[PDB]
Amino acid sequence: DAEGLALLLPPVTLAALVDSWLREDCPGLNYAALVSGAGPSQAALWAKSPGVLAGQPFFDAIFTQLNCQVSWFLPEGSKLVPVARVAEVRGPAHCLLLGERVALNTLARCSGIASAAAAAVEAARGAGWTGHVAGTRKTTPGFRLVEKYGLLVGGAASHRYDLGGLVMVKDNHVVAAGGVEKAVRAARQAADFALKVEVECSSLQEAVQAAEAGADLVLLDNFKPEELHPTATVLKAQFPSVAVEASGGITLDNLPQFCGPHIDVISMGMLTQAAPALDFSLKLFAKE
Template identity: 50%
Template sequence: MEQHAPFSSLLPPPQIESIVHAWLQDDMPSHFDVGGHVVGNEIKSAQLLMKSPGVLAGLPFFQKVFDVCGGCTIQWEDVSIEGTMMDASGSNKVLLATVTGPVSHLLRGERTALNTLSRCSGVATLSYQCKQIAERHNWKGMVAGTRKTTPGFRLVEKYGLLVGGCATHRLDLSQMVMLKDNHIWSAGSITKAVKKAATVAGFTQKIEVECQSLDEAIEAAEAGAHIVMLDNFEPQQLKEDAKKLKEMYPHVIVEASGGITMDSMSDYFDENVDVISQGKLTQGYDCIDFSLKILH
């Protein structure tokens, strides 16, 4: 059976395969796999176990690692559904799948596959917890990640955000225009930066501006920004300025960002705040523990 991964159709197979090839090359850059020579190519099976609690995420990447290693098949258990909070801890390990193939291939892909699953599930778990907090407070906005991703691992971490129930924010530099302080200073003003961006962004891309005050936010909205980020505001000031901004420009999306964590995010919930973004979702997550054990 295939893995239960509702978001897997988002991932283009050629792109994932290219990324996985790079991961495996990074883990084994020379030509010889001495450990593989030791164990040989006898067909063996290994069990994938989840060993700590968290949200399961990253199954398509785990699958693709062993597809690329070659000669391996994966039998997924019915419980292996991405987005599910698993109660795995201590002796209560959860069997997720059985991987079968030449034992040298199993061990060649083992650590790369587990690293990916562990980190993707870590992002999904933290995202899920933040989403739960928003729902408990009946806040209708979106919790989002940022572009603070691990180089070479962006796709996995962004995927984990989605599985956990949060928004990805922009996927990369070219998905949306974000004008930050350095852009503003270089262009000369918020208005100049927005107007110049609009000449090439056309009607297909939104423009967001990072603002440090209500005056800057008003200038950005007046210049044509679609999204205004109120950056590093204290919660009360944020709510007051978001209300004023929405009254003047109800169509503008208001994002709160800057030092917000899972512990402090509820202080920023407000009907005039549409998005709360957190770099911690892809920069400060705990990894979930998995193992792949060869059956004797």
């Protein structure tokens, strides 16, 4: 449930992230503060794009660091129907305007990702698929927490978060280890009981090797849909407990083709690499 997802974000982690963002945008003197002064002010947050609202905890944490308060008129995960009054921000005018750009940039990107995730989830559901749409590690460096949180609000799985999560054996690992069996054997030893092992496979031959070697997940990468489903079918027949992930060249438009009864996970780089930010503005309307 989108409203309960904020509990995932430790307050100390947010504070440090928010502080680094404010430092980036104002490393020294805030000259513009002299223009607005410190009079108690109110600003309206407007949604000018359709999509899904995501990023309230980051938006809040920015303004909290600046001694401003936010009242939300729509819950986290709400559908946005522009032009929508989303929230009021209240505080000293210079603080409101110091937080403005960082807060809007954060909300815009978080929401843009949640919107893309929601559109993919809807397309998958419309296709009658009961698997999970998932994101990837193809996130903006330093900004992963916000992007993965956005995926979650949109109803996608955050999935592989970092290199300390499940042990991912890619094509590159196979080359370095000298074969699928050797690579998976090593991965299984490293993962032990606490972590899953996933193996990126380019053919059915590779997928059977991976499964026989104890992979928890087999990632069928850059298959054509007509090859994907027969491969997954055969795999599920022989290894019923192995999960199947599809990835590579999947878009919102072709997503239904990758949906099938033997695919458990569909991961999409585009959800984080190519989701346009939503258009939000913050308008100061009263002061003193």
